[PDB]
XYZ file of N, CA and C in Angstrom:
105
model
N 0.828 -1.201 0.000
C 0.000 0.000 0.000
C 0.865 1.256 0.000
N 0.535 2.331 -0.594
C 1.192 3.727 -1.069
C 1.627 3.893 0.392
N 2.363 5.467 0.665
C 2.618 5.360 1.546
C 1.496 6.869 2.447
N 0.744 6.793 1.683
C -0.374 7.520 1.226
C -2.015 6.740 2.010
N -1.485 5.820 1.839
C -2.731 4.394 2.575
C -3.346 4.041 1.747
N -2.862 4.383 0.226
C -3.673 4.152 -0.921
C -3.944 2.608 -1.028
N -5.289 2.025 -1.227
C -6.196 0.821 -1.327
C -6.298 0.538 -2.790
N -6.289 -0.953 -3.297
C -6.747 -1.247 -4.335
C -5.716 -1.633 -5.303
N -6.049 -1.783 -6.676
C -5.578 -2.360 -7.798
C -4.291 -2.005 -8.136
N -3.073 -2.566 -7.174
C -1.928 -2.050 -7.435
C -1.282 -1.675 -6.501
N -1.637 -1.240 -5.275
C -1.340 -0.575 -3.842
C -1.678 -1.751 -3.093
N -2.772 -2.911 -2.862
C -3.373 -3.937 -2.102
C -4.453 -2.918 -1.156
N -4.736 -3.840 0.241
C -5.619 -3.591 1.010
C -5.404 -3.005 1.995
N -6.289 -2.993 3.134
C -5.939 -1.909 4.615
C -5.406 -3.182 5.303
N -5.034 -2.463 6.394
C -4.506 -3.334 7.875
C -5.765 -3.670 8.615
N -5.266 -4.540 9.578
C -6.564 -4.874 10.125
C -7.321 -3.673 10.868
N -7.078 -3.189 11.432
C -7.697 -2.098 11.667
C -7.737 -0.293 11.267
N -7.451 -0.971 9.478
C -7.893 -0.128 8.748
C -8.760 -0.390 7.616
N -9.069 0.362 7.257
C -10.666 -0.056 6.117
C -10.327 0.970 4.900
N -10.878 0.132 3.868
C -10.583 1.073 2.673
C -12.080 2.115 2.210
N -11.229 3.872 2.435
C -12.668 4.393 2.215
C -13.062 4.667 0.793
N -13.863 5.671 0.308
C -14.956 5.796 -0.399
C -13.541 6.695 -1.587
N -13.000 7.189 -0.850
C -11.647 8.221 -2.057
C -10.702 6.694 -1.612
N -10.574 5.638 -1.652
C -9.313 4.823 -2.076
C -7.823 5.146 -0.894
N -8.761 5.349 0.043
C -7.764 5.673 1.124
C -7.971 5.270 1.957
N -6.970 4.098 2.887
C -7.363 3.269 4.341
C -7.514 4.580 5.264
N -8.190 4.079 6.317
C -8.754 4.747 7.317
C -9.941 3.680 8.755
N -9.463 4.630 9.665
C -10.365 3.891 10.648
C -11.826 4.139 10.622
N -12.769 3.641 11.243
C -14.073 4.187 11.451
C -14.980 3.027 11.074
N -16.502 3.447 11.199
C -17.418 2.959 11.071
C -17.851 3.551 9.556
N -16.894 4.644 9.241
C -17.273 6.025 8.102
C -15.987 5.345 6.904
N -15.559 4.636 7.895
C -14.583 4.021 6.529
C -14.615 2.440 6.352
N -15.006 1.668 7.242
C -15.150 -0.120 7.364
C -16.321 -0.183 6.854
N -17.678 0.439 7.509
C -18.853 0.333 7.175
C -19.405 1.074 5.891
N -18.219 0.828 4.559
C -18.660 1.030 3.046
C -20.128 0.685 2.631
């Protein structure tokens, strides 16, 4: 993953207690897990 927290096709996924949000950026929350 970027070093950015960038998610997805090329970067991979979040950590476990990070979630990939809605702009392609890991993050914590219910505003970022609960897509």
């Amino acid at each position: 993953s970027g070093p950015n927290g960038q998610c997805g096709p090329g970067w991979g996924g979040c950590r476990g207690g990070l979630c990939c949000s809605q702009y392609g950026y890991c993050g914590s929350g219910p505003k970022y897990c609960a897509h």
